[PDB]
PDB file of C-alpha atoms and ligand atoms in Angstrom:
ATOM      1  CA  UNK A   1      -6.191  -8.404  20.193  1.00  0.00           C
ATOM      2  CA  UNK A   2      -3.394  -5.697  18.694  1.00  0.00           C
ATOM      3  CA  UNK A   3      -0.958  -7.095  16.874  1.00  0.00           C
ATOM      4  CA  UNK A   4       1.828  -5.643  14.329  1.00  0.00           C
ATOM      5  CA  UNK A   5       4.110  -6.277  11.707  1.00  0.00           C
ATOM      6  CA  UNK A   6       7.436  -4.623  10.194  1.00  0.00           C
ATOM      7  CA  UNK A   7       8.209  -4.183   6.834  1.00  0.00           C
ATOM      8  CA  UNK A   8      10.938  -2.500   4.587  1.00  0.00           C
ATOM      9  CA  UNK A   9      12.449  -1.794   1.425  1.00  0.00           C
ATOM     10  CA  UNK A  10      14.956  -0.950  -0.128  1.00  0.00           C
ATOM     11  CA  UNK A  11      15.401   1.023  -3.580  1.00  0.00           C
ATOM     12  CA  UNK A  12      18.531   2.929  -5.602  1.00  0.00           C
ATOM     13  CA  UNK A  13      15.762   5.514  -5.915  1.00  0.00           C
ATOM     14  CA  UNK A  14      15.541   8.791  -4.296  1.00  0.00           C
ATOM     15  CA  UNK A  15      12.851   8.966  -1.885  1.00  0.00           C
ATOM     16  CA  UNK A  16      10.787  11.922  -3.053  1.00  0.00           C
ATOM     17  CA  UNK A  17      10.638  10.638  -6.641  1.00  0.00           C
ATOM     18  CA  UNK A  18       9.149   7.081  -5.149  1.00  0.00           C
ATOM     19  CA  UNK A  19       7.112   8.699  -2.846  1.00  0.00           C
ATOM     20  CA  UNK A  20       5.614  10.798  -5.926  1.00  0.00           C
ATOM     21  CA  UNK A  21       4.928   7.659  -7.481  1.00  0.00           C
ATOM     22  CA  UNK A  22       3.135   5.527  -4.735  1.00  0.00           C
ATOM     23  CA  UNK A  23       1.527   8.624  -3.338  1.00  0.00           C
ATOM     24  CA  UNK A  24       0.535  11.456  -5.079  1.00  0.00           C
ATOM     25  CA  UNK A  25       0.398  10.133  -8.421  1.00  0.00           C
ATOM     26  CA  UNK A  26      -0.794   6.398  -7.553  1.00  0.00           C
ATOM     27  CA  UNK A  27      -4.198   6.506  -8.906  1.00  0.00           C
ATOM     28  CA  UNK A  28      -1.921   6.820 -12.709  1.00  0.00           C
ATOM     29  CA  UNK A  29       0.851   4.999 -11.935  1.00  0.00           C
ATOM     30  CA  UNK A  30      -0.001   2.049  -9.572  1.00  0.00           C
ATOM     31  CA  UNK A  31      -2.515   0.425 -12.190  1.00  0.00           C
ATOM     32  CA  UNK A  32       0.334   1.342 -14.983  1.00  0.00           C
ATOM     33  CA  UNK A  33       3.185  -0.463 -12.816  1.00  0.00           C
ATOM     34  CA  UNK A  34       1.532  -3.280 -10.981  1.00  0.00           C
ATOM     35  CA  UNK A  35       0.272  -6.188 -13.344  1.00  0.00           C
ATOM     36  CA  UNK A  36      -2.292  -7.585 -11.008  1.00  0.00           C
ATOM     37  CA  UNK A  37      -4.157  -3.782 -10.667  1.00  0.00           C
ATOM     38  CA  UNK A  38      -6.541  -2.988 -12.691  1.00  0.00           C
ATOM     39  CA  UNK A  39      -7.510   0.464 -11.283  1.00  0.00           C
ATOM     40  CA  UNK A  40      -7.021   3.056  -8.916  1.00  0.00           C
ATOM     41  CA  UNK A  41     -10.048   5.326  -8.168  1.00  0.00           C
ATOM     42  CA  UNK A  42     -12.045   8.025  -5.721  1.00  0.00           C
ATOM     43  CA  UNK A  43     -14.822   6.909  -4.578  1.00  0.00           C
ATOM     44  CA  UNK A  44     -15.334  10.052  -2.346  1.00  0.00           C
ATOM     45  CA  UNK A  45     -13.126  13.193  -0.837  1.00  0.00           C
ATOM     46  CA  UNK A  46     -10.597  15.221  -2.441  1.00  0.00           C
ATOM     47  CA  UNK A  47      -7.247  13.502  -1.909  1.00  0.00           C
ATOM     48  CA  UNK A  48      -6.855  14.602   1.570  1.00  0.00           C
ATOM     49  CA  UNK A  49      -7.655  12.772   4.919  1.00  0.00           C
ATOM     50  CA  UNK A  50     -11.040  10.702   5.143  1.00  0.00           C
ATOM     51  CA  UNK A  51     -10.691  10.411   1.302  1.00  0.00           C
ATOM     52  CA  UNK A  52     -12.178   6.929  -0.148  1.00  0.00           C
ATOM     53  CA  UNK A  53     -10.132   4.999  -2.800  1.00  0.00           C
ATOM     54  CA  UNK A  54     -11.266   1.541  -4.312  1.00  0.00           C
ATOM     55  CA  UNK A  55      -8.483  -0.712  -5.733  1.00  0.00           C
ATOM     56  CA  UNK A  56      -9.794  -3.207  -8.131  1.00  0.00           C
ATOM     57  CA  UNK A  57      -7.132  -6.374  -8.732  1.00  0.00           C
ATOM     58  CA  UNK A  58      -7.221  -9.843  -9.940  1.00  0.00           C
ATOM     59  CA  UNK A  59      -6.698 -13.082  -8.190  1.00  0.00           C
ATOM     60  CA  UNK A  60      -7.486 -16.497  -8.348  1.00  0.00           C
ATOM     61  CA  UNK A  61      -8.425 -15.021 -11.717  1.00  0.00           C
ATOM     62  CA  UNK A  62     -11.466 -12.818 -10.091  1.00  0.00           C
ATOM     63  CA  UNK A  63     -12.187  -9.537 -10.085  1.00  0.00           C
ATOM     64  CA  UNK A  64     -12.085  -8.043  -6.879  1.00  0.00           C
ATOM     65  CA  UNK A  65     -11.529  -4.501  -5.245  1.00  0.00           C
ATOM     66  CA  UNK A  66     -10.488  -3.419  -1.742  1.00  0.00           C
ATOM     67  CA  UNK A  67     -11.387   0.127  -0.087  1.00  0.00           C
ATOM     68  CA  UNK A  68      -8.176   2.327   1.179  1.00  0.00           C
ATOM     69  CA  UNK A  69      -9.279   5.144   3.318  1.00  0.00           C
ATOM     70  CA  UNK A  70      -6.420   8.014   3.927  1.00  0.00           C
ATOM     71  CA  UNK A  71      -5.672   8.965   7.210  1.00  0.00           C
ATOM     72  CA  UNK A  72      -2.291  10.973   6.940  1.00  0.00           C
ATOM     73  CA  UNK A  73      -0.563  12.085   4.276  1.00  0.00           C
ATOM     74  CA  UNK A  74       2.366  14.274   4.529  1.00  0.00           C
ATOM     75  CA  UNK A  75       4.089  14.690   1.654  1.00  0.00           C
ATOM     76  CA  UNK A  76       6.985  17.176   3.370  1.00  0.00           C
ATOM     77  CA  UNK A  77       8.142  14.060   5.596  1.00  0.00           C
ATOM     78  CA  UNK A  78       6.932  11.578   2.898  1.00  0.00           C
ATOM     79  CA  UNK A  79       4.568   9.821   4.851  1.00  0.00           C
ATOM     80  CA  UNK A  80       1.364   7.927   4.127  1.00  0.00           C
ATOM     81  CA  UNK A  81      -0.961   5.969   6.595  1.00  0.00           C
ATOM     82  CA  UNK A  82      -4.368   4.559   5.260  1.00  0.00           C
ATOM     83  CA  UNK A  83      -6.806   1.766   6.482  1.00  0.00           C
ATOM     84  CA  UNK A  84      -8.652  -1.495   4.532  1.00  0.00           C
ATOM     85  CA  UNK A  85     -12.334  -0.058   5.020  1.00  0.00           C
ATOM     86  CA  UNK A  86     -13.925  -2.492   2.715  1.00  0.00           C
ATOM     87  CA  UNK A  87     -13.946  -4.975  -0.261  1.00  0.00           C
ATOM     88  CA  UNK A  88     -15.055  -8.474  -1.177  1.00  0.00           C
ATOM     89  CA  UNK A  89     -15.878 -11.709   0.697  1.00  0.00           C
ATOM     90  CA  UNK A  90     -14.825 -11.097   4.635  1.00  0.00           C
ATOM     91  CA  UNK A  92     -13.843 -11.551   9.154  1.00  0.00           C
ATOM     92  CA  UNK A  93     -11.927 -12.044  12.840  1.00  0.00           C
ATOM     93  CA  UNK A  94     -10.125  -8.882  11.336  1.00  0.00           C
ATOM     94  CA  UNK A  95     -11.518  -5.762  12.881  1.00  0.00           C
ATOM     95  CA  UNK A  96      -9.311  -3.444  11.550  1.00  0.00           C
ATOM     96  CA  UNK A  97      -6.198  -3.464   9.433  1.00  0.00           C
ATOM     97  CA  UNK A  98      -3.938  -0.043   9.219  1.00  0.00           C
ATOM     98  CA  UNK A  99      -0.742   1.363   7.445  1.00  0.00           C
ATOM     99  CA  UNK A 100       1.863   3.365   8.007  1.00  0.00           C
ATOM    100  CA  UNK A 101       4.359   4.359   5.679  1.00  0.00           C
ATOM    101  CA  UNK A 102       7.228   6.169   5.303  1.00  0.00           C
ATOM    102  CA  UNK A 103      10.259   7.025   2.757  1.00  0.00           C
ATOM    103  CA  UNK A 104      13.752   7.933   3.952  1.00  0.00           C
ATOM    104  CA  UNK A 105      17.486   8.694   3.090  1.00  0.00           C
ATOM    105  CA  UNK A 106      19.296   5.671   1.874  1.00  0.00           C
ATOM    106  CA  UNK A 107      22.425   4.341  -0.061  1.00  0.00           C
ATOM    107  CA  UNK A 108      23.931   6.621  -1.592  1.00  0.00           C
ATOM    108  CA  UNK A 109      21.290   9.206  -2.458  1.00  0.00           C
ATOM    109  CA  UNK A 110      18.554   6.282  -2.316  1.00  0.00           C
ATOM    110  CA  UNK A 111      15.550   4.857  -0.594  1.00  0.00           C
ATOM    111  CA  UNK A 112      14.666   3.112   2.390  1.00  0.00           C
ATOM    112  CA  UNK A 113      10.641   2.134   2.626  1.00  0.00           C
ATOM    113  CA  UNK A 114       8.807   1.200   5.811  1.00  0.00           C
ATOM    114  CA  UNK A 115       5.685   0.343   6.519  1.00  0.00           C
ATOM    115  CA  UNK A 116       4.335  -0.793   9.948  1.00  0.00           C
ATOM    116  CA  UNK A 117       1.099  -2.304   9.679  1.00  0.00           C
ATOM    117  CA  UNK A 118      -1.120  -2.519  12.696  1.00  0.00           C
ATOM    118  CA  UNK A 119      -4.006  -5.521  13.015  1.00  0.00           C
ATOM    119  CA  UNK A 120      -6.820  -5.465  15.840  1.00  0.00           C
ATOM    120  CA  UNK A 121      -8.797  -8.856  16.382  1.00  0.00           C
ATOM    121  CA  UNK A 122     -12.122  -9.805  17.904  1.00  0.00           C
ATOM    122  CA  UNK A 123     -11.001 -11.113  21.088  1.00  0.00           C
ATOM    123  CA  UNK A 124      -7.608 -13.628  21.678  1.00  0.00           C
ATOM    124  CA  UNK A 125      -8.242 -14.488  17.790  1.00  0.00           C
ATOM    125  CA  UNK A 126      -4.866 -14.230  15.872  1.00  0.00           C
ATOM    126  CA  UNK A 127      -3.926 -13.082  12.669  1.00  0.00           C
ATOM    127  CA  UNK A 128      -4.201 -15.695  10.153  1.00  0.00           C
ATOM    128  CA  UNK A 129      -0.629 -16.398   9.059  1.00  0.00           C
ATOM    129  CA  UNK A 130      -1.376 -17.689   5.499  1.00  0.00           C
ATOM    130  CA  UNK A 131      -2.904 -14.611   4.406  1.00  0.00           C
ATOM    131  CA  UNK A 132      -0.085 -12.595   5.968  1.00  0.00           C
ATOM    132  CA  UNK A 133       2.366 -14.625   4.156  1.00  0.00           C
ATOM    133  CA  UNK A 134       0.013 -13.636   1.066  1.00  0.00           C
ATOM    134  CA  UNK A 135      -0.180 -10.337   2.175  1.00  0.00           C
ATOM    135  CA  UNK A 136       3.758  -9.695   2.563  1.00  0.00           C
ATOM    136  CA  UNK A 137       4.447 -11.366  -0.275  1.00  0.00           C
ATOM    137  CA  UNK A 138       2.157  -9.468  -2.817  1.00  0.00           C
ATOM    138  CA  UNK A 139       3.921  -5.447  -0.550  1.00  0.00           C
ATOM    139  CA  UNK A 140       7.448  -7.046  -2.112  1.00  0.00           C
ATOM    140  CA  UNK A 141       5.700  -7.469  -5.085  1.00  0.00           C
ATOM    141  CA  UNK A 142       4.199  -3.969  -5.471  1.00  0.00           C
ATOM    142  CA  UNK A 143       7.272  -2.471  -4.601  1.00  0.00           C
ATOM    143  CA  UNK A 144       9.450  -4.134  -6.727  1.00  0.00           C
ATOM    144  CA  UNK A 145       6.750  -3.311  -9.664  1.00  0.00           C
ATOM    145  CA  UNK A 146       6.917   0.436  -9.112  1.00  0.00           C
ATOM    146  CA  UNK A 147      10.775   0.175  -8.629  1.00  0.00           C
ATOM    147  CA  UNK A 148      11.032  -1.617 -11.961  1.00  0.00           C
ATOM    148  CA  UNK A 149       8.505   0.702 -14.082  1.00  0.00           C
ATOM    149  CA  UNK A 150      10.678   4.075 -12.359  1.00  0.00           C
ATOM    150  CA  UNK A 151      13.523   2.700 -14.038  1.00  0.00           C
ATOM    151  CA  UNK A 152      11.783   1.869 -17.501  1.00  0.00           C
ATOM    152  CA  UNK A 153      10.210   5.787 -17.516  1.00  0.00           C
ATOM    153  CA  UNK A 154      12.010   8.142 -15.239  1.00  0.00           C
ATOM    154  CA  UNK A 155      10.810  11.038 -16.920  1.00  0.00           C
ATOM    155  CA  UNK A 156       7.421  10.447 -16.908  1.00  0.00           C
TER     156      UNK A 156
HETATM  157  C1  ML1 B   1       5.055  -1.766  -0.380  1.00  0.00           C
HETATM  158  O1  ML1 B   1       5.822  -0.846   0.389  1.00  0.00           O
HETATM  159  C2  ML1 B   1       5.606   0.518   0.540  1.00  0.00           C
HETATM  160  C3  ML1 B   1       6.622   1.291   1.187  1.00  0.00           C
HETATM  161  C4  ML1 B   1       6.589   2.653   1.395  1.00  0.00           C
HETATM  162  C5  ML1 B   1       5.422   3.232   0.927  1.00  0.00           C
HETATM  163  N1  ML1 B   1       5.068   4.497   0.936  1.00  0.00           N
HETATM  164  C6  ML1 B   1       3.879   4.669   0.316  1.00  0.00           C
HETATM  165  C7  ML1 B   1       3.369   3.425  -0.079  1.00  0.00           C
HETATM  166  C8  ML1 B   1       2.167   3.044  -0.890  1.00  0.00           C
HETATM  167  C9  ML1 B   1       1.003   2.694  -0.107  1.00  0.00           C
HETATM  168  N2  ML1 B   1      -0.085   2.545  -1.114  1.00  0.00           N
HETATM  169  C10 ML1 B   1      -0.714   1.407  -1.348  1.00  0.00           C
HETATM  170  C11 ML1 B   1      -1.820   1.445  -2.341  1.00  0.00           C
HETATM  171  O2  ML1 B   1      -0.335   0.339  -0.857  1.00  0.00           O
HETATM  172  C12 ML1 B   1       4.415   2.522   0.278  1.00  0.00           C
HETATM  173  C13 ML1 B   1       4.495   1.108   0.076  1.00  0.00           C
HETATM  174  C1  ZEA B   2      -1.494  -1.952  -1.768  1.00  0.00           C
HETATM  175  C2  ZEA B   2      -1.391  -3.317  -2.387  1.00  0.00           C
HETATM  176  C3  ZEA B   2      -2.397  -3.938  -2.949  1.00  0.00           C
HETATM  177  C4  ZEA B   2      -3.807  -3.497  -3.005  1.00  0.00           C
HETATM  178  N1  ZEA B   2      -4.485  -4.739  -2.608  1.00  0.00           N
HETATM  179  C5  ZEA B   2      -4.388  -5.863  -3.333  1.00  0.00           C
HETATM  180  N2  ZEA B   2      -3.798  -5.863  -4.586  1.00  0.00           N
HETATM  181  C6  ZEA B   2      -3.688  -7.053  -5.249  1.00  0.00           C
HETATM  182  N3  ZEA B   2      -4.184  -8.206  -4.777  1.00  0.00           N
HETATM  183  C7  ZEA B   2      -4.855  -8.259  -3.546  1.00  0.00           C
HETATM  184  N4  ZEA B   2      -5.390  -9.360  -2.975  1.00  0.00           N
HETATM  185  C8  ZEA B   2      -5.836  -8.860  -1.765  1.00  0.00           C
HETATM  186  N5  ZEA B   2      -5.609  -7.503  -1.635  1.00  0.00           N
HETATM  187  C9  ZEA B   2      -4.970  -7.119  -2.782  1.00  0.00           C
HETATM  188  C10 ZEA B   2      -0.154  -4.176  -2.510  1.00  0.00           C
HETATM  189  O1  ZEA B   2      -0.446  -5.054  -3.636  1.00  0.00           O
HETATM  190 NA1   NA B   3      -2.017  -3.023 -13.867  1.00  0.00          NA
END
């Protein structure tokens, strides 16, 4: 099955400084902004498309890491769209994809979006807990970056 899911964001923050922080400058800032990332690393490639990043988190009070592999990134529109390539434990999920954008908001801030895109072995469904999870820990990182912006805008 293909199923997706619609997210956004707002932020007071203009959209190329954000995008400066989630994007090209994640691998500092994300583990500086985010309490529940540890680290933010290459694994393989150069920063461009096909490029391998492992993000190592806590939860449940484990260590644990996911894999991030970039697929676009367009800085002059301020877009971003990777894919969850790997990590630890497992399963119906065949594939899970991002993409995100930053645009004009209120006044001179932000809107974020991201549209995330899940394929499924066969009539099996997304699991709805871990989407809840899943959501839930997106407002989370956003709110985290928004929040250390504000605390170091000159950074
Ligand atoms: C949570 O919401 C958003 C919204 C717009 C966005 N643009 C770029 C990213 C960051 C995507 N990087 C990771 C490691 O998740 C982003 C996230
Ligand atoms: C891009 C984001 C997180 C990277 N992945 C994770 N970051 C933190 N906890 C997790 N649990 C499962 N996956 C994760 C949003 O937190
Ligand atoms: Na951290």
């Amino acid at each position: 099955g293909v199923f997706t899911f619609q997210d956004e964001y707002t932020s007071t923050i203009a959209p190329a400084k954000l995008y400066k922080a989630l994007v090209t400058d994640a691998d500092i800032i994300i583990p500086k902004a985010v309490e529940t990332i540890q680290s933010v690393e290459i694994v393989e490639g150069n920063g461009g498309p096909g490029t391998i990043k492992k993000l190592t988190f806590i939860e449940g009070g484990e260590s644990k890491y996911v894999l991030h592999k970039i697929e676009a990134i367009d800085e002059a529109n301020l877009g971003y769209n990777y894919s969850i390539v790997g990590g630890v434990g497992l399963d119906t999920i065949e594939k899970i994809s991002f993409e995100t954008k930053l645009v004009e908001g209120a006044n001179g801030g932000s809107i974020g979006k991201v549209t995330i895109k899940i394929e499924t072995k066969g009539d099996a469904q997304p699991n709805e807990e871990e989407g809840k999870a899943a959501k839930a820990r997106g407002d989370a990182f956003f709110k985290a970056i928004e929040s250390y912006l504000s605390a170091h805008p000159d950074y």
